[PDB]
Amino acid sequence: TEIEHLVQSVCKSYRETCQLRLEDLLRQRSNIFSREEVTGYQRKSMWEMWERCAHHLTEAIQYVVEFAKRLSGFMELCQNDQIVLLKAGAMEVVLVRMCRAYNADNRTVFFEGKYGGMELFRALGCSELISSIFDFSHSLSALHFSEDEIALYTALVLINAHRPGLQEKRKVEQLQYNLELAFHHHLHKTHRQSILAKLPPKGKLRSLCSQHVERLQIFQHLHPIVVQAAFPPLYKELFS
Numbered sequence: 001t002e003i004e005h006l007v008q009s010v011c012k013s014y015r016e017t018c019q020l021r022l023e024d025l026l027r028q029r030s031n032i033f034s035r036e037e038v039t040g041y042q043r044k045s046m047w048e049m050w051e052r053c054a055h056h057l058t059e060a061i062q063y064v065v066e067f068a069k070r071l072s073g074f075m076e077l078c079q080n081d082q083i084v085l086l087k088a089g090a091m092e093v094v095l096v097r098m099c100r101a102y103n104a105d106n107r108t109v110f111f112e113g114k115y116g117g118m119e120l121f122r123a124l125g126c127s128e129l130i131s132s133i134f135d136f137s138h139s140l141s142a143l144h145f146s147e148d149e150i151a152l153y154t155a156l157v158l159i160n161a162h163r164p165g166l167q168e169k170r171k172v173e174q175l176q177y178n179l180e181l182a183f184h185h186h187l188h189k190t191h192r193q194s195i196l197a198k199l200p201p202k203g204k205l206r207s208l209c210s211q212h213v214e215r216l217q218i219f220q221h222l223h224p225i226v227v228q229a230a231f232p233p234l235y236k237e238l239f240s
């Protein structure tokens with residue numbers, strides 16, 4: 001029941017931090033930006049779209065930090081290792097969480113209260129990155145990832161004892177092994193082990209996140225946003 005308790009704990013942390021309810025995202029699928037509304041977004045300054053998107057991504061990261069803080073044993077890791085794991089993994093989790101807000105039927109994402117295609121983001125002038133994020137979301141949406149699958153998979157995106165610069169690798173390994181057992185137990189109970197072969201390959205999430213954060217750092221150098229900093233030790237690693 002330790003592993004059953006861990007599944008319950010991880011799913012509760014996820015529910016408390018997931019931002020939007022799945023049934024709300026699903027109900028809103030017929031609420032699509034009009035041609036007029038899309039043109040309104042396209043005419044916005046690159047720098048206004050950056051401010052909006054940077055705000056949304058900052059809030060998304062903060063919810064992921066709250067998710068990690070509520071994972072059994074995470075707060076018992078040394079601060080160095082908590083920061084190493086969050087710096088490496090929190091934006092990877094944001095990118096995975098996006099698949100819930102993605103509709104593969106019409107290739108739209110839930111953004112500021114309605115669904116829109118990647119054309120909504122034209123003003124940012126990084127069509128290749130936006131295309132890559134949509135493609136990644138399309139790949140995960142095809143799995144029909146359940147809420148518990150997202151919760152347990154994203155716990156494992158964070159709790160990775162291979163991250164360079166960990167000081168207590170054995171302690172991270174112990175948490176990782178328990179979360180791997182929780183995920184694999186849960187897939188067996190729900191007859192969903194078939195998704196293991198279909199999950200993103202080794203390096204796909206890492207390289208997408210590298211490209212994404214590189215672009216956020218370029219925008220932040222050119223046009224810095226003001227962050228409502230909730231996690232000073234982590235903020236200090238990302239901002240300068």
Ligand SMILES: O=C(O)c1ccc(OCc2c(-c3c(Cl)cccc3C(F)(F)F)noc2-c2cc[nH]c2)cc1
Pocket residue numbers: 054055057058061062086087088089090091213216217220225227228229230231232234235236238239
């Ligand atoms: O509340 C906080 O204390 C806090 C700390 C870090 C943080 O990091 C966001 C981030 C960004 C990012 C974002 Cl989301 C928007 C604008 C600019 C940036 C960037 F690139 F300049 F940092 N990019 O990656 C992260 C991140 C955090 C952990 N792992 C990656 C937000 C809030």
